[PDB]
């Protein structure tokens, strides 16, 4: 970029995961964690 | 970048995870942590 | 960057995790920590 | 950066975690800490 | 940085954790500390 | 539970209701409360 | 629970209600309270 | 609980209510309180 | 609890209410209090 | 609790209320107090 | 409104727009602002 | 309003806009502000 | 308002904007401010 | 308002803006302020 | 207001801005102030 304005985003080798929860849950997990 | 203004973001080898919770939960986890 | 203004952000090998909680929880974790 | 103004942020090998809590909790953790 | 003004931040090998609490808690932790 | 680890949740006689609202409302309730 | 670790949660006779609001409201309630 | 570690939570006869508000409100309540 | 470590929480007859407000409010309540 | 370590919390007949406010308010309450 | 209680809301000439976003975005806008 | 109690809200000529963001963003805006 | 109690709110010519952000952002804005 | 109690709020020509941020940010703004 | 009790608030020509920040920031602003 000579006399320019660049916004390059080189990304590689990566995991993007998302989870959404809005209603009330009724579970009981005994073996294993549960982050909310 | 000669006489320029660049905003490059080289990212690699990384994990981005998100979790959202809005409703009231009713669980009982005995074995394992639970951060909220 | 010769006579320039650059804002490069080289990041590598890192974990970004987030958790959100808005409703009231009713649990009882006996074995394991719970930060909120 | 010759006659320049740079803002580079080289970061590596690091963990960023966040947790948010807004509603009232009703737990009883006997074994394990709980910072809020 | 020759005749320049740089703001570099080399960070490595470090843990950033945050926790927020707004609602009233009702717990009883007997074994383990609890900083708030 | 002899030499065991149980996580039983006996619940009875109870009401769980949830409501979610994301868009802007245009009402005018004169007689009656409205919590949001 | 002989030589055990139990996490029982006996709950009875109780009401759990939740309400969420994200968008801007335009109302005018004259008769009745409104907590948000 | 003989030579054990129990975390029982007997709860009864109780009301848990929550309300969340994120957007700007435009009301005018003349008769009745409004906690936010 | 003989030679044990128990964390029992007997609760009864009680009200837990929470309210959250993040956006700017524009009201005018003349008759009635308003704690925020 | 014989040769034990107990953390019992008998609570009864009590009200727990919380209110949070983050944005700027524009009201004018003439009749009634307002603690913030 | 003689010996009455009215809640009239005369509104005119106004724009109400809302936007919601829950999943992770992967963009790069170079020319133009982006509020989230 | 003779011997009455009115709650009229005359509004005119005004813009109400809202934006919500819950997931993690990965952008790079070089030209233009970005409030979140 | 003769022997009355009125709560009128005449508003005109005004802009109400709101923005919410809950997840972690990864940007680099070089030209332009960013309030959060 | 003869023998009355009025709470009128005449507002005009004004800007109300709000911004909320809960998750950790990773930016580098070189040109421009950033209040949080 | 003859034999009355009025609470009028005439406001005009004014800017109300708010910003909230709860998570840890990792920036480096070289040119420009940053109040928190």
UniProtKB/Swiss-Prot annotation, chains A, B, C, D, E, F, G, H, I, J, K, L, M, N, O:
Compartments, record wording: Secreted
Top-level division of the source organism's lineage: Eukaryota
Tyrosine amide: residues bearing it: 36
Post-translational modification: Amyloid fibrils are degraded by insulin-degrading enzyme IDE.
Annotated disulfide bonds: 1-6
Family membership: Belongs to the calcitonin family.
Subunit structure: Can form homodimers. Interacts with IDE and INS. Interaction with INS inhibits homodimerization and fibril formation.
Note from the entry: IAPP is the peptide subunit of amyloid found in pancreatic islets of type 2 diabetic patients and in insulinomas.
Domain description: The mature protein is largely unstructured in the absence of a cognate ligand, and has a strong tendency to form fibrillar aggregates. Homodimerization may be the first step of amyloid formation.
UniProt function note: Amylin/IAPP is a glucoregulatory peptide hormone that plays an important role in the regulation of energy homeostasis. Selectively inhibits insulin-stimulated glucose utilization and glycogen deposition in muscle, while not affecting adipocyte glucose metabolism. IAPP function is mediated by the CALCR-RAMPs (AMYRs) receptor complexes. Amylin can also bind CALCR receptor in the absence of RAMPs, although it is more selective for AMYRs.
Protein name per UniProt: Islet amyloid polypeptide
Species, as recorded: Homo sapiens
Included stretch of the parent chain: 35 to 70 of 89
């Amino acid at each position: 970029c000579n006399t320019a304005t660049c916004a390059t985003q080189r990304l590689a080798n990566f995991l993007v995961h998302s989870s959404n929860n809005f209603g009330p849950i009724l579970s009981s997990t005994n073996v294993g964690s549960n982050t909310y």
